[PDB]
Scaffold this active site. Structure first.
Site, PDB file in Angstrom:
ATOM      1  N   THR A   1       3.925  -1.715  -4.330  1.00 48.04           N
ATOM      2  CA  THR A   1       5.599  -1.179  -4.278  1.00 48.04           C
ATOM      3  C   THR A   1       6.255  -2.386  -4.209  1.00 48.04           C
ATOM      4  O   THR A   1       7.352  -2.627  -4.606  1.00 48.04           O
ATOM      5  CB  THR A   1       5.711  -0.233  -3.117  1.00 48.04           C
TER       6      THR A   1
ATOM      7  N   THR B   1       0.163  -2.107  -0.566  1.00 49.23           N
ATOM      8  CA  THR B   1      -0.399  -2.051   0.734  1.00 49.23           C
ATOM      9  C   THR B   1      -1.331  -1.067   1.276  1.00 49.23           C
ATOM     10  O   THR B   1      -2.211  -1.118   2.094  1.00 49.23           O
ATOM     11  CB  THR B   1       0.989  -1.789   1.636  1.00 49.23           C
ATOM     12  N   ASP B   2      -1.782  -0.020   0.325  1.00 50.13           N
ATOM     13  CA  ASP B   2      -2.460   1.072   0.622  1.00 50.13           C
ATOM     14  C   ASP B   2      -3.971   0.469   0.745  1.00 50.13           C
ATOM     15  O   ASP B   2      -4.566   0.930   1.802  1.00 50.13           O
ATOM     16  CB  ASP B   2      -2.638   2.254  -0.597  1.00 50.13           C
TER      17      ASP B   2
HETATM   18  N1  LIG Z   1       0.900   3.113  -3.191  1.00 52.69           N
HETATM   19  C1  LIG Z   1       1.472   1.661  -2.958  1.00 52.69           C
HETATM   20  C2  LIG Z   1       2.095   1.540  -1.597  1.00 52.69           C
HETATM   21  C3  LIG Z   1       2.670   0.211  -1.063  1.00 52.69           C
HETATM   22  O1  LIG Z   1       2.274  -0.790  -1.843  1.00 52.69           O
HETATM   23  O2  LIG Z   1       3.337   0.283  -0.125  1.00 52.69           O
HETATM   24  C4  LIG Z   1       0.468   0.568  -3.223  1.00 52.69           C
HETATM   25  O3  LIG Z   1      -0.419   0.541  -2.432  1.00 52.69           O
HETATM   26  O4  LIG Z   1       0.446   0.151  -4.315  1.00 52.69           O
END
Ligand SMILES: N[C@@H](CC(=O)O)C(=O)O
Ligand SMILES: N[C@@H](CC(=O)O)C(=O)O
Ligand SMILES: N[C@@H](CC(=O)O)C(=O)O
Ligand SMILES: N[C@@H](CC(=O)O)C(=O)O
Lengths: 317, 314, 315
Positions: C12, C78-79
């Site tokens: 993201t 982040t995931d």
């Molecule tokens: N689903 C996204 C969430 C994020 O980056 O905050 C990812 O991990 O690519």
């Protein structure tokens, strides 16, 4: 078996609703299989009654004990209220890499579910552990090993009141099994510049509690009482009320060191935020808390009142 | 659309007049008919009882209006908890009152104020916010004013409720409550500042080893009506300080025990005999909010038992 | 001027946008370093695979072996940032800084967290004290050791934590300070080498609960699992029907490693489960998803219970 000395200072760990060091061991008899333990009563006080006098006596006794070839570690039984201040003081005055462990209990020995027996058992295991060498002074509470720089009591009553809000525990001790995951990279113990061996009295340092509609009369009273330093527990990132700031400016101009901390509980009281420390003559205490900033400022004042030299101390330790 | 008034008081969120603050988040205007009013323009570290009284009386006036659904107050983060707690006991309305700020100024990379303000507007108009008491809305969280504190110097997530937790959430404007305070607030408060021009002086003292009597003595000489003692551990004083607080309380200055530690109750019937020494135990607050409650208490009584009942109620 | 390569993987943080666009959005970084951008993948981190992990690790090792290159930053979702950071923490053969960074809000959002996070990452990557700290995650003004870091919240900008330790350092408007360092071996000290590996060993994770089952253990065995992480109840406890199936799995030579669903603490040896009698490994102070990464790397050199227990008790 390793040789350890327990120095007893008092605290709720030694309370009954005061117990001796032999009687504390006798409540955890298992402890004697880990180490050859000698007990010595240094003080018998609630830690809310601690003084610089007792700190000096304790630090000089720890240095004497650890200088002995046969003595592997010291454990200090202590009240939980000011254990963070004693531990931080020792962290900067103990001239040894040998382990120094502070331990207490939030419930007295007589209580249902008294926490002291397990805390003391775990403290012995940490003290004799090879990996505890050169970790600095540690507080061992509730199965956690906390670096003295980082430790604080963060709750009034909980057995889990100790935390290291800026960095977390450095290790664990679970039924005597000792694991370290991190270590402080801030200099301590043998690497400390401070030496209290020839000091009989520590410099007076007051702490002020900031709030809206604040005052100059407490700065004024600390100055009148001969404060050599003042810790200001400021609002948010060490911010003063203007009237108080003015009084602290006057204090600093007179040669009383003013060091900015925070009332908030965690985080760095930073340089180059809203307070022009260089113009006003203040030190920013960075990632400490008011009560440990007081200890470092008291030690700084044993050898300088220069603003730049004291900022470098807070930016180092 | 619901009418909401935003009272601006200053703080890092405005590090900028309220029109341009509101204009940075145009989306808020889809939600509500928004009017902005500049009450003060100060860092919250400069707040005083005079601005608190001005602010409380204005909020009361706005919420007494049939067409005004809610008030948002943009504020510095440093003493937001004191302003919110004061309003939580002086606003005579169940309509929402939301305090919001920002840890980074609007000019910053990743400024937090736009999302915080958007969320605040969504909380203010939400039907479920009625009778929740005054709330702080920060970092997607809704905190009861009784419980909220700034726990970190710099972090966008500095706000916490260390004795409870947040009562709710707001995530891209989607508002959900999970709990509510069971301590009386707002319409149920006994306090009324409508005729008060000046609040009683209450000092705060910071306890430590090798403590002193001189700061107690100075508060008395300055005409303090109350002293909050931010004690070691469970509100414990150093003996020299305790003796001075005992003298203070015997003179009719109310001494209320809190703690420097950050969380937990400063309890009755622990190591301090409050009844014999003439002190109040502030229980589950912190020094700065206990100061607010003692300031309000002192507007109608200096009686120890009555002030202990106030701390044990609110 | 220090030279830094930013390897973009998606996430993201890039919510879509090209690397130069992400870089152009924080112009202040160009005064700090000579920045080169490279697109390694363009996926949400929920789509990450071992194939991408290997491509990333080999490329980071190539870059850091260059005398001209000071550090690498990896922009990431982040995931599963914690799994990529932990994998790199044990496969990067350098002491040079490796920083992972992401954003819980897309660049388009009100109060987007990506710009400050990236700015802070660049400051961490060039900082002299970041040398030999191991792979780090830099999020929300915090520096987290890859061994200890986890995403602990679904949405919050402060979702990253190190629940068994805490952050090792801070970065506030680019000012970098370390307070602690890991004492667990990483990077140049790690025994693992993925240079000639094209496919990592299959490791499944199972979620324990009351009234549990043997069918998911059996399905993982049937699908050729080489290891299973059991995310157990409390201190790594299984339900009896599940334990029986795990014992059969371990007997067959599939390595069973006990972790916990709870979120923090150690899944300890010599508690309620007799690991030696049952043929299991206790993962101690990790979480199920990082225990998976360490088990996959363990399985590139051994399937031996004692040898894998020593790996979990060292790294
Ligand atoms: N689903 C996204 C969430 C994020 O980056 O905050 C990812 O991990 O690519
Ligand atoms: N007041 C006691 C509290 C404790 O030990 O838990 C002390 O600090 O000595
Ligand atoms: N000093 C500022 C800090 C902030 O708002 O974050 C204030 O409280 O006004
Ligand atoms: N495994 C035990 C743990 C405990 O009660 O502490 C149980 O859940 O029954």
């Amino acid at each position: 078996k390793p040789q350890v000395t327990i120095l007893a200072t008092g605290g709720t760990i030694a309370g009954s609703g005061a117990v001796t060091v032999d009687k504390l061991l006798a409540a955890v008899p298992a402890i004697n299989d880990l180490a050859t333990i000698k007990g010595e009563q240094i003080s018998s006080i609630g830690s809310q009654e601690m003084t610089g006098k007792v700190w000096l006596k304790l630090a000089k006794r720890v240095n004497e004990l650890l200088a002995q070839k046969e003595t592997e570690a010291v454990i200090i039984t202590h009240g939980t209220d000011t254990m963070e201040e004693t531990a931080f003081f020792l962290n900067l005055t103990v001239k040894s890499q040998k382990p120094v462990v502070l331990v207490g209990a939030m419930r007295p020995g007589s209580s249902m579910s008294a926490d002291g027996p397990m805390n003391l058992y775990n403290a012995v295991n940490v003290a004799i552990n090879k990996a505890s060498t050169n970790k600095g002074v540690v507080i061992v509470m509730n199965d956690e090993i906390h670096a003295a720089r980082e430790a604080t009591k963060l709750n009034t009553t909980a057995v889990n009141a100790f935390a290291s809000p800026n960095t977390g525990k450095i290790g664990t001790v679970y039924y005597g099994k000792v694991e370290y995951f991190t270590q402080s990279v801030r200099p301590h113990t043998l690497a400390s510049e401070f030496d209290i061996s020839k000091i009989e009295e520590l410099p007076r340092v007051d702490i002020l509690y900031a709030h809206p509609d604040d005052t100059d009369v407490l700065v004024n009273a600390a100055l009148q009482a001969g404060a050599k330093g003042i810790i200001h527990a400021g609002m948010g990132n060490g911010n003063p009320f203007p009237l108080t700031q003015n009084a602290l400016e006057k204090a600093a101009k007179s040669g009383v060191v003013v060091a900015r901390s925070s009332r908030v509980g965690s985080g760095s009281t930073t340089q180059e935020a809203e307070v022009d420390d260089k113009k006003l003559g203040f030190v920013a205490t960075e990632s400490l808390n008011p009560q440990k900033a007081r200890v470092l400022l008291m030690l700084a004042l044993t050898k300088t009142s220069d603003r730049e030299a004291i900022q470098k101390i807070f930016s180092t330790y």
